[PDB]
Design a protein around this ligand. Sequence first.
Ligand SMILES: N#Cc1c(Cl)ncnc1Nc1ccc2c(c1)CC(=O)N2
Ligand SMILES: N#Cc1c(Cl)ncnc1Nc1ccc2c(c1)CC(=O)N2
Ligand SMILES: [Cl-]
Ligand SMILES: [Cl-]
Ligand SMILES: [Cl-]
Ligand SMILES: [Cl-]
Lengths: 4, 4, 124, 124
Amino acid sequence: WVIP
Amino acid sequence: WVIP
Amino acid sequence: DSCIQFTRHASDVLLNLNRLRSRDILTDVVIVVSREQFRAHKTVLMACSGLFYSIFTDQLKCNLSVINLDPEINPEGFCILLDFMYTSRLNLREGNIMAVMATAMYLQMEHVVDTCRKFIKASE
Amino acid sequence: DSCIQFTRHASDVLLNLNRLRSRDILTDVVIVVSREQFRAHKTVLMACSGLFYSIFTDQLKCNLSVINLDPEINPEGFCILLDFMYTSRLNLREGNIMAVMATAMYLQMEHVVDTCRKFIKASE
Ligand SMILES: N#Cc1c(Cl)ncnc1Nc1ccc2c(c1)CC(=O)N2
Ligand SMILES: N#Cc1c(Cl)ncnc1Nc1ccc2c(c1)CC(=O)N2
Ligand SMILES: [Cl-]
Ligand SMILES: [Cl-]
Ligand SMILES: [Cl-]
Ligand SMILES: [Cl-]
């Protein structure tokens, strides 16, 4: 999971 | 395009 | 093999599947979550959820145009997860995390359940 | 928005769509290319090809279960492109590049046409  |  | 790969292909396919969903193009099922209804593509649902994969591979349920979810399922939680299926983006907030996690457990979406558990553990 | 994103989601959806295709699960059209037939999902074809997007948004053609391609289309070229649609991987070889490029032009798959033009220009 990432900060897009 | 890339070499996978 | 000796194939070349187009990095953005999978993302572009998903963007178009979401565009088709928004325009109600070739949607083949309606998911009913208490008073709310959500139109979708069976193949996208199966590709994202262990529960839908099970349902639409069933010899009788594969032909249904309406699927009614358990009455305990929160429509907002389902809406957030349906958006995630079509976009890779999860709108996870303090006010919805419990509903999102419960819905992801029911839908059998392991990666979502995992990030919800981690975000909850960080706040305790 | 304040969303989080699962990097591998789009790739995992596509992998599952390919698995469904291989098992002939919820495939809803057969593409006929001279003596050869290819089963697929209309939504994936539309999401990858300008030609299929046009065909399946047509009020009459959207309901067809069989689509016959132009007799000049090479089945191997179509097979290579269908695999690319479901995998992001293009099996581009000296022996098939002309057929692949012609098929990609017909199917309106701009990124494929682009790499074919570049590979051809490098060999001249
Ligand atoms: N459609 C399809 C499909 C196929 Cl073909 N093969 C394997 N899994 C498929 N889908 C599916 C099954 C289980 C789970 C998910 C998706 C996400 C998750 O957390 N569990
Ligand atoms: N399905 C869908 C779709 C939608 Cl909804 N919106 C926009 N394009 C869509 N698909 C589509 C149209 C034109 C081309 C491609 C795909 C690849 C390419 O080279 N040209
Ligand atoms: Cl029904
Ligand atoms: Cl997931
Ligand atoms: Cl027909
Ligand atoms: Cl393309």
